[PDB]
Design an enzyme around this catalytic site. Structure first.
Site, mmCIF file in Angstrom:
data_model
loop_
_atom_site.group_PDB
_atom_site.id
_atom_site.type_symbol
_atom_site.label_atom_id
_atom_site.label_comp_id
_atom_site.label_asym_id
_atom_site.label_seq_id
_atom_site.Cartn_x
_atom_site.Cartn_y
_atom_site.Cartn_z
ATOM 1 N N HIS A 220 14.614 106.660 -67.391
ATOM 2 C CA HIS A 220 15.213 107.202 -68.618
ATOM 3 C C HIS A 220 14.712 106.456 -69.865
ATOM 4 C CE1 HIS A 220 18.600 109.206 -70.899
ATOM 5 N NE2 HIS A 220 18.409 108.146 -71.667
ATOM 6 N N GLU A 221 14.829 105.130 -69.863
ATOM 7 C CA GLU A 221 14.405 104.339 -71.016
ATOM 8 C C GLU A 221 12.889 104.353 -71.234
ATOM 9 O OE1 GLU A 221 16.568 103.427 -73.175
ATOM 10 O OE2 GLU A 221 18.244 103.903 -71.849
ATOM 11 N N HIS A 224 12.032 107.510 -73.153
ATOM 12 C CA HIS A 224 12.225 107.255 -74.593
ATOM 13 C C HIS A 224 11.034 106.482 -75.178
ATOM 14 C CE1 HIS A 224 16.240 108.757 -75.093
ATOM 15 N NE2 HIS A 224 16.808 107.859 -74.310
ATOM 16 N N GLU A 245 18.371 112.651 -76.590
ATOM 17 C CA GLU A 245 18.975 112.396 -75.283
ATOM 18 C C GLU A 245 18.898 113.607 -74.346
ATOM 19 O OE1 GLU A 245 19.685 109.791 -73.890
ATOM 20 O OE2 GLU A 245 19.695 108.348 -75.497
HETATM 21 ZN ZN LIG Z 1 18.813 107.802 -73.559
#
Ligand SMILES: [Zn+2]
Length: 401
Positions: A220-221, A224, A245
């Site tokens: 997830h990170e 980003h 998100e």
């Molecule tokens: Zn996030």
């Protein structure tokens, strides 16, 4: 035994099987400074990627301490003692190492991490429009054993959490005037993360109490980070749950961003890439740096998949941009990692986390590169039993709901 090399002779992404007490050498183990602070011991796990097994009291000046505030938002957790001992820092380093190898064991993670390493922050640091120049905040200062410093460009730092241990995020240093994460340039990304804790959620198939695989949380990170390194992050005012998100989670959640709005974002960032192409074309000199202008120009042709004509002039190809943009925004998603790992996970970003658990993924009897908690050829293999916080109770210690 950590099971860091389940197949072959050596780890495929992480460059060394480090121990925290391994001596500094100025190359891949070194005391470093972020451009004040005392030097911190850091480990270079790959080209462009460093790990700092310390609580993050550095990146934010107003967060220089691990002191909890007066009781504090519901979903939060504090322990000023976490990650203060060398045994812990060793376990953090091996845990993060193990998770990079798990991510890189999937086709999708090889793609993502490759894109990350290639996504060098742009040399847009000159006040003179015709000069290429690095941006200082896209570097760290690496100390040698003799005590000299050298500046080293990097793309990604993984560091320990600040005060709130479970507040993971991907952040970076801003510029005076440039919006580096939204203008195509990109900037060095700092990910606050811990492999020693994870989150609980409920799922039926009475309701089971399960735990998120920390390989999914790190991915997830990193997703980003990919957006931010290519300077194509959604304005965080677009929302609270941000569009950024929803995009990163993917799946049916992403569908809720309307297709006309998406077209408009894509056009904006297409034009931003064209602006980068002309900056490179108008470039006359380089300060830095014993590397030629032509060589650095080419680093960024490679990053942004730019076309070069016979005259050596650069342009953005619509099909190559669509390919790159789609990879970063549509293919690299949490939902897609869930499918590749074959783990249980929240079905929407909107889900409320129930609990926090202490975990230890470093022993291979607890967690593997191939199976995570759901160990094959055992009772944990079926029905996501390895992630079930009651069936696999020995792997999850509840700290809080
Ligand atoms: Zn996030």
């Amino acid at each position: 035994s950590s099971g860091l090399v389940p197949r072959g002779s050596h780890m495929q992404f992480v460059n060394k099987q480090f121990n925290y007490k391994d001596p500094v050498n100025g190359v891949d183990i070194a005391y470093i400074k972020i451009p004040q602070m005392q030097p911190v011991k850091a480990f270079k796990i790959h080209n462009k990627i460093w790990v700092i097994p310390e609580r993050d009291t550095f990146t934010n000046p107003e967060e220089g301490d691990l002191n909890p505030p007066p009781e504090q938002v519901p979903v939060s957790y504090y322990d000023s003692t976490y990650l203060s001992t060398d045994n812990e820092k060793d376990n953090y380093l091996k845990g993060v190492t193990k998770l990079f190898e798990r991510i890189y064991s999937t086709d999708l993670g090889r793609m993502l991490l490759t894109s990350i390493v290639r996504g060098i922050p742009f040399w847009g640091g000159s006040t003179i429009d015709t000069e290429l120049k690095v941006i200082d905040t896209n570097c760290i200062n690496v100390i040698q054993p003799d005590g000299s410093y050298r500046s080293e460009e990097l793309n990604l730092v993984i560091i320990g959490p600040s005060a709130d241990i479970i507040q993971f995020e991907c952040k970076s240093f801003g510029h005076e005037v440039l919006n580096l994460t939204r203008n195509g340039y990109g900037s060095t990304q700092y990910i606050r993360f811990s492999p020693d804790f994870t989150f609980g959620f409920e799922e039926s198939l009475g309701a089971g109490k399960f735990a998120t695989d920390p390989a999914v949380t790190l991915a997830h990170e990193l997703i980003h980070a990919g957006h931010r390194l290519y300077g194509i992050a959604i304005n965080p005012n677009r929302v609270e749950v941000s569009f950024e998100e929803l995009r990163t989670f993917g799946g049916h959640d992403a569908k809720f961003i309307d297709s006309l709005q998406e077209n408009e974002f894509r056009l904006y960032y297409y034009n931003k890439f064209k602006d980068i192409a002309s900056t490179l074309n108008k470039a006359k000199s380089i300060v830095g740096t014993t590397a030629s202008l032509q060589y650095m120009k080419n680093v960024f042709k490679e990053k942004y998949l730019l076309s070069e004509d016979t005259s050596g002039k650069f342009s953005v190809d619509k099909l190559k941009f669509d390919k790159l943009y789609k990879m970063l925004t549509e293919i690299y998603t949490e939902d897609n990692f869930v499918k590749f790992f074959k783990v249980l996970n929240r079905k929407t970003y909107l889900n409320f986390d129930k609990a926090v658990f202490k975990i230890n993924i470093v022993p291979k009897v607890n967690y593997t590169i191939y199976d995570g908690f759901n160990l094959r050829n055992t009772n944990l293999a079926a029905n996501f039993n390895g992630q079930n916080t009651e069936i696999n109770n020995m792997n999850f210690t509840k700290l809080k709901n």
